[PDB]
Amino acid sequence: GPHMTFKALKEEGNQCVNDKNYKDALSKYSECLKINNKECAIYTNRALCYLKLCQFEEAKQDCDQALQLADGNVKAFYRRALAHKGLKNYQKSLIDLNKVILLDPSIIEAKMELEEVTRLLNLKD
């Protein structure tokens, strides 16, 4: 029957992401972590799924796990910055955002983030 592998789970996980069903994507990607935990793509996308469920603290850790595998993964920094921002950790987020700017200053999204997070940090809210 269906020969679902790490790659299949990755693909089906991507489907849930595009379907905006990130809570199910978590399940798919977590099954990948039963097979292989050296894939920062799983963590970075799982973190994204957490971000959509407002689970920033979880997403932060998944992004770290991604960086543990690949020290320089822009996806991991950017989505960790998003996580930190959601946890009101603006100083922390700026560290990851600036890091993204160092690795890939071509990312317009990041240019909008570090400007925003600084204003949040400049607020007492």
Side-chain angles (χ1 to χ4, degrees), residues 57-122:
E57 189 64 74
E58 302 297 90
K60 183 210 296 175
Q61 297 170 89
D62 261 64
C63 298
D64 182 71
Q65 289 292 147
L67 286 179
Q68 293 181 31
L69 310 176
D71 181 78
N73 189 330
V74 180
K75 298 179 179 298
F77 292 117
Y78 182 78
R79 295 178 182 164
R80 181 201 271 168
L82 305 181
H84 277 296
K85 188 204 302 185
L87 302 170
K88 302 184 65 60
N89 298 333
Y90 306 127
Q91 176 60 212
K92 295 289 184 180
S93 175
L94 285 176
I95 302 172
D96 297 293
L97 291 174
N98 278 274
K99 176 47 159 286
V100 174
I101 306 302
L102 310 177
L103 299 176
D104 202 311
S106 181
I107 306 190
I108 303 300
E109 307 306 273
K111 291 302 188 69
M112 304 294 169
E113 295 303 89
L114 85 311
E115 76 166 287
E116 176 182 80
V117 178
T118 304
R119 303 182 310 236
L120 301 172
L121 180 63
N122 277 216

Side-chain angles (χ1 to χ4, degrees), residues 26-85:
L26 293 175
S27 308
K28 301 297 173 299
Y29 290 131
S30 300
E31 286 186 64
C32 302
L33 301 177
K34 301 195 300 85
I35 305 160
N36 174 87
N37 291 268
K38 291 293 175 59
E39 181 62 284
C40 37
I42 301 300
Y43 289 104
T44 47
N45 290 331
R46 224 182 64 131
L48 173 61
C49 303
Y50 281 131
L51 294 175
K52 307 296 290 183
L53 297 179
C54 304
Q55 292 182 88
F56 309 109
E57 189 64 74
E58 302 297 90
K60 183 210 296 175
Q61 297 170 89
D62 261 64
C63 298
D64 182 71
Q65 289 292 147
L67 286 179
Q68 293 181 31
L69 310 176
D71 181 78
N73 189 330
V74 180
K75 298 179 179 298
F77 292 117
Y78 182 78
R79 295 178 182 164
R80 181 201 271 168
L82 305 181
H84 277 296
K85 188 204 302 185

